[PDB]
């Protein structure tokens, strides 16, 4: 009767809390927390006396409802309510142990997300702070819900309906309500992964979410756009990138009519301007597992279309600032190129350089005769940095619009840019703001050096003139890059087999230094310092290298010893990430 009645009480009370907000809601939670504590002991003694412990449908039907009411309180504005809810996860986890002592059989099967639940306890045991700071930790854990669950898949939907209706009222009306909406919005994003998997509520959530980035509402429209950009970019679950990019690309895809003619619109101009910050923030943030998700989607088409709209936007103080950020966005896009997926990297990079060269015009602020347009100096300065990243290791390839010998086309293409850089180089001369020219001059010199390295054969002749340049500083840089070319081998030539093998022979010895008593300081120290994102690369190199040196046993003994000694649950950690 105890479980028949006690469980039946839980189902009734939990449903009431979800039904609507009440003044004493924060008080029922504290009392309801104690109810769980007072029924765990009875199960413990009951199991000890007689295992026989029953789980009728109400016990299952009410165990789910307990979770469905613990998640919905994580975003509750009251700090105490969320803090109590986090502490309430201990009782949910501890209940698993009593029912089944063996963790793997049931604790990791009945409660798939057991490990994350344990983390909530540590976070709760921290100094109180504003809801914004707390939400960061809460939303971080909400993004780590790997296993879908009935409570998770139903808590996401239950609050999704509540969030949607709240949003309509705010817009329909021609501040405390918004703060709750912000928490609901952030909460509804971090836990999207569980609800993942055509038409689906998750997809419909994105559509409305994307339809709010351009929300023009006189009353509170600015705040909505100001916050959706901040949260969606910096808080979205990495498991939702393949859906965001597709929807983001499709929205842009329709901005261009037939025959590739831009249809300039203020909303479209605002939409692209917001897309730049979101993509930059999304790419800026490095997290574990984000790289794995970036590969699935193809960002080439979106980037190519994005520049065209901004390219035709025209010239103005506002448009220059947008172009400047776009140049910086492409620069950030070249730091994760290994993580990203490209169908044709060469064909895409060459076009981007072509589209960017149009904007790099030097000495255009003096002709304008207005100091207000000094931003063009930054835009040109920013443009060079983007082109430098694009040109790093990029062989030239001319577009096949006309039928000519490839060798001639490449040589013409090379001199097209070589002349362009030299013209800008002359303007940066001090005789013809010093930091601007000094910084810009350095970038312009570096850009030419990278271009020569990619294709020496087709550009060596055109670059010989730099030897006798008018700037002594420029001549030194050219000689250094030229010196490296000589050291490099034109062909394989067994040059790396001899020079690089001997040159890098000592490298393995330092990394493979047999620390006394198997200390291996380099390997042990390197393990912790290396970011988690590249652990895949680190693991293969360490295993491969030590095997070649016949010292694999030493590395395994040291690495495993620290993990096993640190945590008595050696098996559990090994299966964990």
């Amino acid at each position: 009767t105890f479980w028949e009645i006690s469980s039946q009480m839980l189902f009734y009370i939990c449903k009431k809390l979800t039904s609507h907000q009440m003044l004493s809601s924060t008080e029922i939670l504290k009392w309801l927390r104690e109810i769980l504590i007072c029924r765990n002991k009875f199960l413990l003694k009951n199991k000890q006396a007689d295992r026989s412990s029953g789980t009728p449908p109400i016990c299952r039907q009410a165990q789910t409802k307990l979770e469905v009411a613990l998640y919905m309180f994580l975003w509750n504005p009251d700090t105490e309510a969320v803090l109590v809810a986090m502490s309430c996860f201990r009782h949910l986890c501890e209940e698993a142990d009593i029912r089944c002592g063996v963790d793997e059989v049931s604790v990791h099967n009945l409660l798939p997300n057991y490990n994350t639940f344990m983390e909530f306890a540590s976070v709760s045991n921290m100094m109180s702070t504003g809801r914004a700071a707390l939400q960061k930790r809460v939303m971080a854990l909400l993004r780590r819900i790997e296993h879908p669950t009935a409570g998770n898949t139903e808590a996401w939907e239950d609050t999704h309906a509540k969030w949607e209706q709240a949003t309509k009222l705010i817009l329909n009306y021609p501040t405390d309500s918004l703060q709750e909406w912000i928490n609901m919005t952030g909460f509804l994003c971090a836990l999207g992964g569980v609800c993942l998997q055509a038409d689906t509520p998750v997809s419909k959530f994105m559509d409305r979410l994307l339809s709010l980035m351009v929300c023009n509402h006189e009353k509170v429209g600015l705040q909505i756009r100001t916050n959706v950009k901040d949260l969606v970019g910096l808080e979205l679950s990495p498991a939702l990138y393949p859906m965001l990019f597709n929807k983001l690309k499709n929205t842009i895809s329709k901005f261009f009519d037939s025959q590739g003619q831009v249809l300039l619109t203020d909303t479209n101009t605002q939409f692209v301007e917001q897309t730049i910050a979101i993509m930059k923030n999304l790419l800026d943030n490095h997290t574990e597992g984000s790289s794995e998700h970036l590969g699935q989607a193809s960002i080439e088409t979106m980037m190519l279309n994005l520049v065209r709209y901004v390219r035709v936007l025209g010239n103005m103080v506002h448009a220059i600032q947008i172009k400047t950020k776009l140049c910086q966005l492409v620069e950030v896009m070249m730091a994760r190129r290994d993580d990203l997926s490209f169908c044709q990297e060469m064909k895409f990079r060459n076009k981007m350089v072509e589209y960017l060269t149009d904007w790099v015009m030097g000495t255009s602020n003096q002709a304008a005769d207005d100091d207000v347009k000094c931003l063009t100096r930054d835009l040109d300065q920013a443009s060079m940095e983007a082109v430098v990243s694009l040109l790093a290791g990029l062989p030239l390839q001319p577009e096949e619009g006309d039928g000519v010998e490839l060798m001639e086309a490449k040589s013409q293409l090379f001199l097209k840019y070589f002349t362009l850089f030299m013209n800008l180089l002359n303007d940066c001369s001090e005789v013809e703001m010093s930091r601007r020219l000094a910084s810009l001059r350095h970038c312009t010199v570096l850009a030419m050096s990278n271009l020569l390295n990619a294709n020496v054969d087709s550009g060596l002749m055109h670059s010989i003139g730099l030897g006798y340049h008018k700037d002594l500083q420029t001549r030194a840089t050219f000689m250094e890059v030229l010196t490296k070319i000589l050291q490099q081998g034109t062909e394989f030539d067994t040059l790396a087999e001899t020079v690089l093998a001997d040159r890098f022979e000592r490298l393995v010895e330092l990394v493979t230094m047999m620390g006394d008593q198997g200390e291996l300081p380099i390997a042990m120290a390197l393990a912790n310092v290396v970011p988690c994102s590249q652990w895949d690369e680190l693991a293969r190199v360490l295993v491969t290298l030590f095997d070649s040196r016949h010292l694999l046993y030493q590395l395994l003994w040291n690495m495993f010893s620290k993990e096993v000694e640190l945590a008595d649950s050696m098996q559990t950690l090994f299966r964990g990430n």
Binding site: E292, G295, D338, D339, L340, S341, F342, C343, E345, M346, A392, G393, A496, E497, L500, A501, R503, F504, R506, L507, V508, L510, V511, M513, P521, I522, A525, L526, N528, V529, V530, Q534, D536, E537, L538, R540, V541, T544, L545, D547, S548, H550, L552, Y553, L556, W557, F560, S561, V564, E565, D568, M570, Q571, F574, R575
Partner: protein, 195 residues
């Protein structure tokens, strides 16, 4: 599985011994059997996955028929019970099979012991391949250069007993600077791929 003890690769044999030593060392400081944990862990995580889904591993091009697949799934549960020496609890469906596993408890132990009996130091086992491994080396140099500062900080915290001049921290800065910055990575024709 028991018969093919010789076919086990030498690389895994070393890996299994390290776990055996780790468990033995863990037990010493603390009737758990080190071999039992090693055997159960290895079988569950290495041998078992292939049996359950050979198609996913790539053993068979075509997915096995569902009826054949069910036998494989049930086979794994019976085999795993042998390693753990656990009888059927609230599992009357499969309880009759409990008799068979009793005989095979000893057989499973012998296979685990053979791999776990490898010498801690491979003095007898020698393979002087000494391959150049040029491709792997390139990644190592790039990674060290990227984390040159960070790796130094960890060394700085410790090693106060003896000066670092003759220790990796001093050598790393000197040698790494001599090699110079790493070259740019080459482009990839293939699409993004992972292990």
């Amino acid at each position: 599985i028991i018969s093919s003890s010789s076919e086990f690769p030498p690389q895994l044999r070393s890996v299994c011994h390290c776990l055996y030593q780790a468990t033995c060392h863990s037990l010493l400081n603390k009737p758990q059997n080190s071999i039992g944990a090693v055997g159960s862990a290895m079988f569950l995580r290495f041998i078992n996955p292939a049996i359950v889904s050979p198609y996913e591993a790539g053993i068979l091009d075509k997915k096995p028929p569902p009826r054949i697949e069910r036998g494989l799934k049930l086979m794994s549960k019976i085999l795993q019970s042998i390693a753990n020496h656990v009888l059927f609890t609230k599992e009357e469906h499969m309880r009759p099979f409990n008799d068979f596993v009793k005989s095979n408890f000893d057989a499973a132990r012998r296979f685990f012991l053979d791999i776990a009996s490898d010498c801690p130091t491979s003095d007898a086992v020698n393979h002087s391949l000494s391959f150049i491994s040029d491709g792997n080396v390139l990644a190592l140099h790039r990674l060290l250069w990227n984390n040159q500062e960070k790796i130094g900080q960890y060394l700085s915290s410790n090693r106060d007993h003896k000066a670092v001049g003759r220790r990796p921290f001093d050598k790393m800065a000197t040698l790494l600077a001599y090699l110079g910055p790493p070259e740019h990575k080459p482009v990839a024709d293939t699409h993004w791929s992972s292990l």
